[PDB]
């Protein structure tokens, strides 16, 4: 019951094989033994990557055909969502799970996407022709008209 | 806070909020299905921010909202806190930004160097952690890792050369540093790194261009050979022998005694003569007690690993894992240790054991003991199957295909037959090269329909099914009447037109529409292209219609939100530029659109016979269900083996989230009603109704019915009363984007008997039974739909309905679907002039006796609904009014076909009658077929005029020989069988033995009470495998994916393996076998001289099959034997062998000859010979330390000479490992790595020592290379 790493630093954790779960954290390791690092694998119907050190399941987005996609931490698809990669980048795939780009409303409340579809945070723009601020914690559009100062003289 | 179920979320000026199953708003922290959230004091949900809850400070999740650790600055200061809000202490937490902290024992940040879990680490004055990037700390500069921030070494550029620095953040001088990628350096005195070839402390190493330090290098550097070690680079010369095992003579003064009795099949255990890792065997004499040799008697058998072995591994290893169990001194034995020392080892182990055969008496505690270790070893377990997943592989893990060899494996030899994949649309194999192949392989073992003896044998059992009552029962009242055709695409579609010809033959199915609707068969026929072929033979069987079922799963049936809408329904395609004022049909398409078109459908233009469904019991069940028992952590994988226990409790969450009052589903169907109304008011099909959707998938048959069961049994007796004459079908809608007005609701609309059109207003033969026929159906898909007050919506139910009154058969609302048996219990309204019923937003409609009723059009949202549904029929209908048309007896056609679609054969309804699912019996009178016989008159009222019951043949159960086991197999639902004839036949012994579903008796009783009540029985026809056969014989076996190819990287090639193959020869398939075949050549002669297309042969009954075995498949899902489970000797490559006294090969050492072993110089070069004494010729032969080595025809290693190429081109009896490899000068196989050649061309060599050509490769360190075609660098 324990994680031993080569002197290459191969890691197997004692020895498992195929998809499991040790310590609540997605893993997966081949045939052989060796802990999946760094990359997409895939296990019965839904493609998982898992992280470079830990090796822990988590989204990630890759270039399939021309287009940008985007996967779940379960290894699903994400459509009709924000989805991040392992960079940091948070993404939205709308119900073709194609990436959006520039300003759109979902759920009433309005985001900025780069033209890389990145979406941006504390950030500052006239986009409606009119300012508006995107939140520093979820990116949503807010008109930066009500005092945030709490204490009257 | 403890959890709740059952209340939607919704969204209010961007919000989300959460309404309960009560219907109350919720506030303050919530777990709500196992996911942590708060809502403040206006109900709205909080993401992305802190709350502050009892004595805990909790961040919620800005996508999901769900509780998660963050970091918060609280006052000046940072803090930790973890999911459930509590100050964390000594641990890392990642913030939002994904940066990290640490914060010790008090709960503050660490600032600065710190050691943690004696990691070295840096944070900077905020307490931030510094990851991927240098930092100078202590007047020193270090390096931390990407993701760990661990310090290491690591190398910059300054100025315009490279440095190196280490763990330490000292820059290093005289010595070899890493950087992050995992190259290697060395660095001089004066810090700069060194390229070229170099000598250090005595010792040389290859560095390249870049600095790169190269391992598993071979090239001519001194202009002379050098080998620079996979382990530091240090240069070897490769002139020293690696070899640790000189010739040594292995017999003494106990192989005589241990030597065999004899060499045939009573002193060894076999199996067609090979011999396996498990054989046991008579041996001389035995070391009783460990103290005298006694001369054997017959029973005296024992183990041959107790004295030979295939190879110095698994000897040191057998005597690793013998020591380990009491045996003896425990041993850490390797190939590399001498062979004397393995050899007498073995024989200290060898007494041990005969101590405790006479301490236990017995032999059965070894015999497990050598079960357990053989499959220890990778050659005689899975490891060498390579087991895979990908397509039909997912179902067992993959599969072998055998092959003809007569040399070897003669007994096993197909005669030049296994035709693989010839399905319908590769019936002649013109599409062998690509995937239109056909997936010959799928279950089990697959049994070879392209042997002209095997198809007989199919026809006999096909005869036998067709008349199972008169043969088994004398009672010509219990005979099935048609048949479904299991896995059409996974055997030869030869089949199809041997069953055709049969029905035609017998019951003269060609002749009229009586005739062929007798008989009623169906054909399970996945593949999108079926429907054209099927119709080219004369449509002798219905082709599914998945076109349709595809569209329901898309529009109505799958998923809670996102949709197709209901405008794909009419694929208006179909015509040329979807005019659907002009209506002029498109001749020319690219292979699109819905089988039949139902926009316009007045009969005029000729359609594909065809049954369509909206589930079945291997259709939106078996997956829902499991999900189901993975996500309850009931089982793990959808290939996981589950009893029938775990089944239950799985089921009661299934059905928890069918009947879910919320109307979400997460395993289950949505808008199933809406499906089935659609399905049964369709013109030109034969539908099809699931059990499942009447009546609930587990415990006992019929035992209780679905929330589904009223609305669907209305639908199914109007349609005996309304549905005839001509369709239309439309949508408020004109393709994926709705405008303004636009709800994209679809009426479907039927005419009455006669009436072909809208605008048609009565009979061409003046009948008046149009009158009170026909039916109107709205559905809608989206169960948050509201109207415009402006919109109206109408059903035009035809000219030939002017001013008539109408009332609601099924209409929609907010709790449910309300069902009206009769006229007088249901609202009325009535069409206009022009034979519309209109609908507004708002509608008052009125019983026809006084009172008055509101109905609002409005999607609603419930378990039995997502969406609308109203069905409306006319008043006035008579109790016994039937719109059903009789079939016809005279030749209406000359065309040869069997089914023709028309109004007499879409008056059919099959019902298909059971579920995987379904418990076993608790008693003898709730078993299927006693309950189907008592429920007969039921389905009568119902309209099925043909039974589908399940397959009625004896499961195969928990029986495994080897392999993944299939559920078919341990739920006994009847598609996984040892015995094809045995349908609940009685135990020899006289004792009942019924199947899943009862005797014998109870089936023929089933049948005759479905006769009995005018409905026909369907046989299910499963022709392409058998499972669980007891007998093991030798077949020749390739690694092979689905189609029968060759899986690209296998070595598994051609291989000798034990399958299980053989029948009992003693069981029903062997009385009943063939019998009835000579009775039909005789009477109709033309069956068997008729040749099939694939073959070019008729079928052939000059041989009859009692028996089953190898000959007659095309080959097994993989047993989990191993590759080399049948003994080989690694010199020679042949197999050992008993069977025939002229022709026997063993070891030398059972023969009481001196078997030597090892590697011997002579002046010509080096030989070796195998632990079993035979010299090595024309084979890779691996030394006790790992090497590879390859002998050549003569006998002698292949090895380089000086000034020569070292690349050698090979071509072995073993096939698949042909190619170019690399040798050095002491004869040691270069592999996964690179070689130079005596020209300075550089090439790369595989795992395995192969060659590669014409591709990228890519390194550990991140380092890119370009093999050109003829095998050279680039780079
Ligand atoms: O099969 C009957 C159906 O056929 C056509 O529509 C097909 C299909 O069209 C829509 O979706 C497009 C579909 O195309 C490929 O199949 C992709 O691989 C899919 O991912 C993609 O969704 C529609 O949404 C589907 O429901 C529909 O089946 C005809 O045009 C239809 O009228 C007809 O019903
Ligand atoms: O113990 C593993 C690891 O814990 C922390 O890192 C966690 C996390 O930090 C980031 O989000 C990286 O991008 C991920 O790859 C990491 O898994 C500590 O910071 C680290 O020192 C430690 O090794
Ligand atoms: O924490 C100990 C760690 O050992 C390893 O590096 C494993 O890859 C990782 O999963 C584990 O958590
Ligand atoms: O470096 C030590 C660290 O390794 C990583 C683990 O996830 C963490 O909990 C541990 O303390
Ligand atoms: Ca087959």
Excluded: C
């Excluded at chain 2, 900077?124 to 930092?135: A, D, L, T, W």
């Excluded at chain 2, 017995?362 to 220890?376: G, H, M, N, Q, Y």
């Excluded at chain 2, 699109?592 to 939106?620: E, Q």
């Amino acid at each position: 019951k324990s994680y031993v790493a080569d002197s290459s630093g191969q890691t197997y954790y004692f020895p498992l094989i195929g998809l499991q779960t040790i310590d609540g954290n997605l893993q997966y390791f081949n045939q052989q033994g060796v802990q999946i690092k760094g990359g997409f694998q895939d296990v019965n119907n839904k493609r998982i990557y898992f992280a470079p050190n830990t090796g822990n399941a988590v989204a990630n987005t890759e270039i399939i055909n021309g287009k940008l996609q985007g996967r779940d931490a379960n290894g699903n698809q994400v459509k009709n969502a924000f989805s991040k990669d392992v960079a940091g980048n948070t993404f939205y795939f709308d119900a073709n799970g194609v990436m959006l780009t520039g300003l759109q409303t979902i759920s009433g409340k309005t985001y900025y996407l780069d033209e890389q579809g990145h979406l941006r945070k504390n950030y500052a723009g006239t986009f409606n022709n009119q300012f508006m601020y995107f939140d520093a914690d979820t990116g949503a559009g807010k008109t930066a008209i009500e005092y945030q100062f709490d204490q009257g003289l | 806070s403890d959890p709740i179920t059952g209340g939607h979320y919704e969204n209010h000026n961007g919000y989300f909020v959460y309404i309960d199953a009560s219907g109350k708003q919720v506030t303050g922290l919530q777990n709500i299905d196992g996911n942590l959230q708060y809502f403040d004091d206006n109900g709205y949900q909080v993401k992305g921010s802190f709350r502050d809850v009892n004595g805990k400070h909790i961040y919620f999740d800005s996508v999901t909202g769900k509780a998660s650790s963050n970091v918060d600055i609280v006052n000046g200061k940072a803090q930790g806190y973890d999911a459930q809000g509590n100050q964390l202490k000594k641990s890392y937490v990642a913030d939002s930004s994904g940066q990290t902290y640490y914060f010790d024992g008090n709960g503050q940040p660490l600032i600065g160097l710190q050691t943690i879990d004696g990691n070295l680490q840096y944070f900077n004055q905020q307490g931030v952690q510094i990851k991927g990037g240098f930092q100078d700390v202590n007047n020193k500069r270090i390096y931390f890792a990407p993701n760990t921030g661990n310090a290491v070494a690591n190398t910059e550029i300054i100025n315009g050369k490279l440095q190196g620095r280490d763990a330490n953040g000292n820059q290093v001088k005289n010595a070899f540093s890493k950087d992050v990628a995992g190259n290697t350096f060395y660095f001089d005195a004066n810090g700069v790194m060194l390229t070229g070839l170099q000598t250090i402390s005595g010792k040389t190493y290859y560095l390249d261009e870049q600095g790169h330090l190269r391992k598993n290098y071979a090239g001519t550097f001194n202009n002379q050979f050098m080998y620079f070690d996979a382990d530091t680079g240090a240069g070897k010369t490769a002139i020293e022998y690696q070899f640790d095992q000189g010739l040594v003579s292995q017999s003494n003064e106990n192989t005589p005694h241990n030597a065999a009795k004899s060499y045939d099949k009573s002193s060894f255990e076999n199996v067609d003569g090979y011999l396996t890792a498990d054989t046991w065997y008579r041996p001389t004499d035995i070391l009783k007690n460990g103290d005298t040799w006694t001369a054997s008697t017959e029973t005296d058998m024992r183990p041959l690993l107790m004295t030979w072995w295939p190879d110095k591994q698994t000897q040191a290893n057998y005597l690793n894992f013998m020591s380990s169990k009491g045996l003896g001194i425990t041993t850490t034995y390797t190939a590399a240790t001498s062979q004397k020392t393995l050899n007498d080892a073995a024989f200290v182990i060898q007494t041990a054991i005969e101590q405790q055969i006479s301490l236990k008496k017995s032999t059965e505690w070894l015999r497990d003991a050598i079960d357990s270790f053989v499959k220890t070893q990778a050659n005689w377990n899975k490891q060498t199957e390579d087991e895979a997943f990908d397509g039909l592989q997912w179902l067992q893990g993959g599969f072998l295909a055998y092959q003809d060899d007569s040399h070897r494996t003669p007994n096993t030899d197909s005669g030049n037959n296994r035709k693989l994949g010839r399905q319908p649309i590769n019936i002649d194999g013109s599409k062998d090269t690509t995937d239109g192949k056909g997936s010959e392989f799928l279950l089990a073992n697959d049994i070879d329909n392209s042997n002209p003896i095997v198809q007989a044998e199919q026809l006999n059992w096909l005869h036998y099914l067709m008349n199972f009552g008169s043969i088994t029962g004398n009672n010509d009242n219990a005979n099935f009447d048609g048949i479904r055709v299991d896995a059409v695409d996974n055997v030869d579609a030869d089949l199809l037109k041997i069953a055709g010809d049969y029905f035609k033959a017998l019951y003269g199915t060609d002749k009229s529409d009586a005739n062929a609707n007798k008989h009623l068969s169906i054909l399970e026929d996945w593949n999108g292209k079926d429907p054209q072929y099927v119709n080219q033979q004369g449509n002798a069987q219905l082709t599914m219609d998945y076109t349709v079922t595809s569209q329901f799963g898309n529009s109505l049936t799958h998923g809670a939100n996102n949709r197709s809408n209901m405008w794909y329904f009419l694929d208006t395609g179909y015509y040329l530029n979807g005019d659907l004022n002009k209506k002029i049909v498109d001749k020319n398409r690219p292979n699109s659109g819905t089988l039949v078109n139902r926009i316009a459908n007045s009969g005029d233009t000729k359609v594909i016979p065809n049954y369509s469904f909206v589930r079945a019991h291997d259709y939106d069940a078996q997956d829902p269900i499991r999900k189901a028992m993975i996500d309850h952590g009931i089982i793990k994988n959808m290939q996981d083996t589950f009893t029938f226990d775990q089944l239950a409790q799985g089921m009661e969450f299934y059905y928890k989230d069918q009947e879910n009052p919320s109307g979400f589903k997460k395993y289950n169907d949505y808008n199933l009603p809406s499906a089935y109304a659609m399905l049964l008011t369709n013109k030109d099909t034969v539908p099809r109704v699931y059990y499942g959707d009447m009546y609930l998938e587990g415990g006992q048959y019929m035992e209780k019915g679905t929330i589904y069961n009223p609305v669907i049994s209305a639908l199914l007796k109007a349609r005996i009363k309304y549905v005839s004459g001509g369709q239309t079908m439309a949508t408020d809608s004109s393709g994926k984007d709705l405008k303004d007005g636009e709800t994209d609701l679809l009426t479907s609309v039927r005419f009455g008997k006669g009436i072909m059109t809208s605008d048609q207003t009565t009979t061409q033969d003046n009948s008046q039974d149009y009158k009170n026929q026909g039916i109107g159906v709205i559905v809608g898909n989206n169960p948050d739909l509201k109207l415009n007050n402006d919109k109206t919506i109408t059903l035009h139910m035809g000219k030939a309905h002017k001013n008539q009154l109408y009332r609601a058969l099924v209409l929609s609302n907010d709790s449910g679907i309300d069902v009206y048996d009769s006229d007088d219990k249901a609202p009325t309204l009535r069409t206009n002039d022009n034979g519309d019923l209109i609908f507004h937003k708002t509608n008052t409609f009125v019983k026809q006796d006084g009172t008055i009723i509101n109905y609002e059009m409005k999607g609603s949202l419930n378990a039995l609904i997502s969406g609308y549904l109203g069905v409306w029929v006319p008043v006035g209908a008579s109790d016994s009014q039937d719109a059903r048309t009789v079939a016809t007896e005279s030749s209406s056609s000359n065309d040869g076909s069997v089914f023709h679609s028309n109004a007499a054969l879409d008056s059919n309804v099959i019902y298909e009658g059971f579920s995987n699912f379904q418990a076993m019996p608790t008693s003898p009178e709730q078993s299927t077929n006693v309950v189907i016989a008592t429920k007969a008159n039921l389905f009568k009222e119902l309209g099925i005029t043909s039974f589908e019951l399940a397959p009625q043949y004896r499961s195969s159960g928990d029986t495994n020989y080897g392999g993944m086991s299939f559920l078919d197999s341990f739920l006994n639902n009847g598609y996984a069988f040892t015995d094809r004839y045995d349908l609940g036949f009685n135990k020899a012994d006289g004792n009942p033995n019924p199947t899943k579903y009862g005797t014998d008796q109870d089936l023929r009783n089933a049948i005759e009470a479905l006769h009995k009540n005018g409905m026909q029985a369907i046989a299910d026809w499963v022709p392409d495998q058998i499972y669980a056969l007891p007998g093991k014989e030798v077949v020749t076996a390739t690694r092979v994916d689905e189609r029968g190819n060759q899986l690209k990287d296998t070595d598994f090639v051609n291989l000798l393996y034990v399958a299980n193959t053989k029948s009992s020869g003693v069981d029903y398939q062997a009385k009943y076998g063939g019998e009835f075949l000579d009775k039909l050549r005789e009477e109709y002669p033309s069956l068997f001289k008729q040749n099939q297309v694939s073959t070019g042969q008729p079928i052939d009954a000059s041989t009859k099959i009692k028996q089953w075995s190898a000959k007659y498949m095309n080959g097994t899902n993989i047993l989990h034997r191993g590759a080399y489970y049948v003994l080989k000797d690694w010199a020679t490559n042949q197999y050992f062998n008993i069977a025939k006294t002229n022709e026997v090969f063993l070891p030398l050492q059972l023969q009481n000859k001196d078997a030597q072993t090892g590697f011997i110089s002579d002046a010509s070069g080096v030989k070796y010979y195998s632990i079993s004494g035979y010299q090595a010729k024309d084979t890779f032969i691996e030394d006790g330390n790992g090497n590879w080595y390859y002998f050549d025809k003569d006998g002698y290693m292949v090895r380089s000479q000086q000034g020569e190429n070292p690349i050698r081109t090979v071509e072995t009896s073993v096939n698949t490992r042909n190619g170019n490899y690399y040798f050095m000068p002491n004869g040691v196989e270069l592999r996964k790595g690179f070689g130079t050649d005596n020209s300075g061309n550089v090439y790369y060599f595989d795992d395995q020592g192969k060659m590669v050509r014409d591709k990228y490769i890519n390194d550990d360190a991140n380092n890119f290379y370009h093999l050109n075609v003829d095998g050279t660098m680039s780079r």
